[PDB]
Ligand binder design. Sequence first.
Ligand SMILES: C[C@@H](CC(=O)O)Sc1ccc(Cl)cc1
Length: 133
Amino acid sequence: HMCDAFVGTWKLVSSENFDDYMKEVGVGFATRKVAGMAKPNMIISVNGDVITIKSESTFKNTEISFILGQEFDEVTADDRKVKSTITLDGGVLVHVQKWDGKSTTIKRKREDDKLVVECVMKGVTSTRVYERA
Ligand SMILES: C[C@@H](CC(=O)O)Sc1ccc(Cl)cc1
């Protein structure tokens, strides 16, 4: 019942600072433009200890499955090959991606009827708000 309030189908409704976040991560111009247009659906499900998070959009479809605290390999939508670990910290899903000596953290939180996604790379944050589909 660890992630009960996260489970479901969620649609992106607002974004702030995402272009700058992608620049900080190292995403190139054309990918930033096309990725920034996308309005993905994020689909979160749980089966036993295994959490699955899918992102589906016109730009890319991604899927990760994982156990909390257990590192895994991920290919991001921008084609980074990263080592990821996802934990629950005080009811917040905290997703750290490591690659090429760099790191970024993505936090996912339930706030009112929204799922808020905060993406941080160095001093640059983007906030992406999802609502139930
Ligand atoms: C958490 C991701 C954003 C989200 O799911 O709303 S971060 C990310 C996504 C796409 C690219 Cl092209 C780069 C980074």
